[PDB]
Enzyme design. Sequence first.
Site, PDB file in Angstrom:
ATOM      1  N   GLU A 147      -3.549  13.384   1.617  1.00 15.50           N
ATOM      2  CA  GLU A 147      -4.873  12.890   2.068  1.00 15.50           C
ATOM      3  C   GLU A 147      -5.675  14.068   2.622  1.00 15.50           C
ATOM      4  O   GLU A 147      -6.764  14.364   2.104  1.00 15.50           O
ATOM      5  CB  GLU A 147      -4.638  11.818   3.145  1.00 15.50           C
ATOM      6  CG  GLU A 147      -3.886  10.634   2.534  1.00 15.50           C
ATOM      7  CD  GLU A 147      -4.247   9.337   3.195  1.00 15.50           C
ATOM      8  OE1 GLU A 147      -4.014   9.240   4.445  1.00 15.50           O
ATOM      9  OE2 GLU A 147      -4.761   8.425   2.530  1.00 15.50           O
ATOM     10  N   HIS A 164       4.908   6.639   7.529  1.00 16.75           N
ATOM     11  CA  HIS A 164       4.711   6.237   6.155  1.00 16.75           C
ATOM     12  C   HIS A 164       4.267   7.494   5.416  1.00 16.75           C
ATOM     13  O   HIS A 164       4.005   8.526   6.007  1.00 16.75           O
ATOM     14  CB  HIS A 164       3.673   5.120   6.019  1.00 16.75           C
ATOM     15  CG  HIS A 164       2.378   5.564   6.565  1.00 16.75           C
ATOM     16  ND1 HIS A 164       2.028   5.427   7.894  1.00 16.75           N
ATOM     17  CD2 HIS A 164       1.313   6.129   5.968  1.00 16.75           C
ATOM     18  CE1 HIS A 164       0.825   6.004   8.095  1.00 16.75           C
ATOM     19  NE2 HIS A 164       0.355   6.492   6.882  1.00 16.75           N
ATOM     20  N   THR A 209      -6.763   6.214   7.834  1.00 22.49           N
ATOM     21  CA  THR A 209      -7.179   6.514   6.474  1.00 22.49           C
ATOM     22  C   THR A 209      -7.055   5.284   5.569  1.00 22.49           C
ATOM     23  O   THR A 209      -7.390   5.369   4.391  1.00 22.49           O
ATOM     24  CB  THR A 209      -6.390   7.666   5.872  1.00 22.49           C
ATOM     25  OG1 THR A 209      -5.077   7.185   5.634  1.00 22.49           O
ATOM     26  CG2 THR A 209      -6.490   8.914   6.708  1.00 22.49           C
ATOM     27  N   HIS A 256       1.864   9.038   1.849  1.00 23.98           N
ATOM     28  CA  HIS A 256       0.891   8.876   0.766  1.00 23.98           C
ATOM     29  C   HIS A 256       1.360   9.852  -0.305  1.00 23.98           C
ATOM     30  O   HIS A 256       1.749  10.971   0.035  1.00 23.98           O
ATOM     31  CB  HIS A 256      -0.532   9.236   1.207  1.00 23.98           C
ATOM     32  CG  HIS A 256      -0.965   8.434   2.391  1.00 23.98           C
ATOM     33  ND1 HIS A 256      -1.701   7.259   2.308  1.00 23.98           N
ATOM     34  CD2 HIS A 256      -0.725   8.618   3.719  1.00 23.98           C
ATOM     35  CE1 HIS A 256      -1.932   6.813   3.542  1.00 23.98           C
ATOM     36  NE2 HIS A 256      -1.272   7.588   4.427  1.00 23.98           N
ATOM     37  N   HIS A 303       0.827  -1.198   0.000  1.00 27.86           N
ATOM     38  CA  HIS A 303       0.000   0.000   0.000  1.00 27.86           C
ATOM     39  C   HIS A 303       0.865   1.253   0.000  1.00 27.86           C
ATOM     40  O   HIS A 303       0.612   2.145  -0.800  1.00 27.86           O
ATOM     41  CB  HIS A 303      -0.994  -0.016   1.155  1.00 27.86           C
ATOM     42  CG  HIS A 303      -1.732  -1.309   1.251  1.00 27.86           C
ATOM     43  ND1 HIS A 303      -2.720  -1.700   0.336  1.00 27.86           N
ATOM     44  CD2 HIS A 303      -1.634  -2.315   2.146  1.00 27.86           C
ATOM     45  CE1 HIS A 303      -3.215  -2.875   0.681  1.00 27.86           C
ATOM     46  NE2 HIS A 303      -2.552  -3.274   1.804  1.00 27.86           N
ATOM     47  N   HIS A 347       2.908  10.737   7.523  1.00 26.38           N
ATOM     48  CA  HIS A 347       2.140  10.423   8.730  1.00 26.38           C
ATOM     49  C   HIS A 347       3.052   9.722   9.739  1.00 26.38           C
ATOM     50  O   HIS A 347       3.572   8.627   9.396  1.00 26.38           O
ATOM     51  CB  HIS A 347       1.012   9.462   8.357  1.00 26.38           C
ATOM     52  CG  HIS A 347      -0.038  10.211   7.595  1.00 26.38           C
ATOM     53  ND1 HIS A 347      -0.988   9.553   6.871  1.00 26.38           N
ATOM     54  CD2 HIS A 347      -0.341  11.540   7.550  1.00 26.38           C
ATOM     55  CE1 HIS A 347      -1.808  10.409   6.314  1.00 26.38           C
ATOM     56  NE2 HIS A 347      -1.434  11.656   6.716  1.00 26.38           N
TER      57      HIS A 347
HETATM   58  N1  LIG Z   1      -2.888   7.005   7.324  1.00 27.87           N
HETATM   59  S1  LIG Z   1      -2.873   6.441   8.767  1.00 27.87           S
HETATM   60  O1  LIG Z   1      -1.850   7.004   9.570  1.00 27.87           O
HETATM   61  O2  LIG Z   1      -4.209   6.363   9.274  1.00 27.87           O
HETATM   62  C1  LIG Z   1      -2.285   4.776   8.556  1.00 27.87           C
HETATM   63  C2  LIG Z   1      -2.088   4.115   7.387  1.00 27.87           C
HETATM   64  F1  LIG Z   1      -2.269   4.722   6.175  1.00 27.87           F
HETATM   65  C3  LIG Z   1      -1.635   2.860   7.315  1.00 27.87           C
HETATM   66  F2  LIG Z   1      -1.433   2.257   6.145  1.00 27.87           F
HETATM   67  C4  LIG Z   1      -1.369   2.132   8.490  1.00 27.87           C
HETATM   68  S2  LIG Z   1      -0.832   0.427   8.313  1.00 27.87           S
HETATM   69  O3  LIG Z   1       0.110   0.428   7.201  1.00 27.87           O
HETATM   70  O4  LIG Z   1      -0.279  -0.097   9.616  1.00 27.87           O
HETATM   71  C5  LIG Z   1      -2.207  -0.561   7.680  1.00 27.87           C
HETATM   72  C6  LIG Z   1      -3.300  -0.710   8.728  1.00 27.87           C
HETATM   73  O5  LIG Z   1      -4.281   0.298   8.601  1.00 27.87           O
HETATM   74  C7  LIG Z   1      -1.581   2.759   9.731  1.00 27.87           C
HETATM   75  N2  LIG Z   1      -1.320   2.058  10.957  1.00 27.87           N
HETATM   76  C8  LIG Z   1      -2.099   2.319  12.180  1.00 27.87           C
HETATM   77  C9  LIG Z   1      -1.808   1.324  13.216  1.00 27.87           C
HETATM   78  C10 LIG Z   1      -0.476   1.055  13.689  1.00 27.87           C
HETATM   79  C11 LIG Z   1      -0.289   0.057  14.684  1.00 27.87           C
HETATM   80  C12 LIG Z   1      -1.382  -0.654  15.164  1.00 27.87           C
HETATM   81  C13 LIG Z   1      -2.683  -0.410  14.713  1.00 27.87           C
HETATM   82  C14 LIG Z   1      -2.909   0.592  13.735  1.00 27.87           C
HETATM   83  C15 LIG Z   1      -2.045   4.053   9.769  1.00 27.87           C
HETATM   84  F3  LIG Z   1      -2.214   4.677  10.970  1.00 27.87           F
HETATM   85 ZN   LIG Z   2      -1.260   7.540   6.458  1.00 17.66          ZN
END
Ligand SMILES: NS(=O)(=O)c1c(F)c(F)c(S(=O)(=O)CCO)c(NCc2ccccc2)c1F
Ligand SMILES: [Zn+2]
EC number: 4.2.1.1
Length: 257
Positions: free
Chosen positions: A103, A91, A195, A93, A61, A116
């Site tokens: 976003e 990470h 997101t 976007h 992703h 983020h």
């Molecule tokens: N944009 S965002 O910050 O809301 C975002 C993501 F885009 C994203 F891809 C992730 S991920 O890659 O871990 C895929 C799962 O949604 C997280 N992670 C949030 C998170 C981290 C640890 C435990 C639980 C959730 C995540 F927080």
């Molecule tokens: Zn994100």
Amino acid sequence: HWGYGKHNGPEHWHKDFPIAKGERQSPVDIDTHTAKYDPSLKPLSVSYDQATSLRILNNGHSFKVEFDDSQDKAVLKGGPLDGTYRLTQFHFHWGSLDGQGSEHTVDKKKYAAELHLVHWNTKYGDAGKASQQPDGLAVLGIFLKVGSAKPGLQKVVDVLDSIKTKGKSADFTNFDPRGLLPESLDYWTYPGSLTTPPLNECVTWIVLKEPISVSSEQVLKFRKLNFNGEGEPEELMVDNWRPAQPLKNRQIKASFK
Ligand SMILES: NS(=O)(=O)c1c(F)c(F)c(S(=O)(=O)CCO)c(NCc2ccccc2)c1F
Ligand SMILES: [Zn+2]
Ligand SMILES: NS(=O)(=O)c1c(F)c(F)c(S(=O)(=O)CCO)c(NCc2ccccc2)c1F
């Protein structure tokens, strides 16, 4: 599975994750004229001096840098937050073109990319349990515009060729996330969600007003990543952003002016 394409992208996510149509989804458009300055908000405290980066991974992703979050090494507090939030990963976007990729939007403006930094509330003990709580996570969002290079991003850009496809990871130690921050910590804040699926409504969003500048060459390297695994059909990892969702019954607060 879920993704960003026509057939599995954001408009389809609600079928597996009905909270996609919930009351506090992210991202949103930040209408800067409607955001209320809140003089009671505190300065954000970003304490990243002892951060321990571990690994960088292409998860199909995005790519993410993961941190040791087994102690209070890299923490966010203050601002709108009660308590202490530990950095677990960052990470990005980004777009297929410099005029899209973020976003959040600001007065409908899209930036080239958004960074983020994901933190979890230590009162919940681990990030997984934190993600099940309405105040579990705090995500610090930083916009990227294309202009001069960001030196502190280059170590990331230079390793991306080694994690080109889904499931690849590399050791990524001694990366200092302070080198990704703008000068000002003036921010907007609102209650929202992840997101990406599972779209949990567990995030206090803190979006910095000041973008960072990255070079065209830096962002070009993001766009060479692949969504697909090694030895499947090539799909460049671009446009991995969810569009703005309805604000519903939320107010966006400003820390400034
Ligand atoms: N944009 S965002 O910050 O809301 C975002 C993501 F885009 C994203 F891809 C992730 S991920 O890659 O871990 C895929 C799962 O949604 C997280 N992670 C949030 C998170 C981290 C640890 C435990 C639980 C959730 C995540 F927080
Ligand atoms: Zn994100
Ligand atoms: N993000 S990193 O480990 O790759 C790195 C750089 F490569 C880098 F060049 C810098 S620099 O641009 O500030 C100039 C040489 O130090 C920082 N900066 C980390 C930092 C930023 C503000 C205050 C304290 C540390 C930096 F952290």
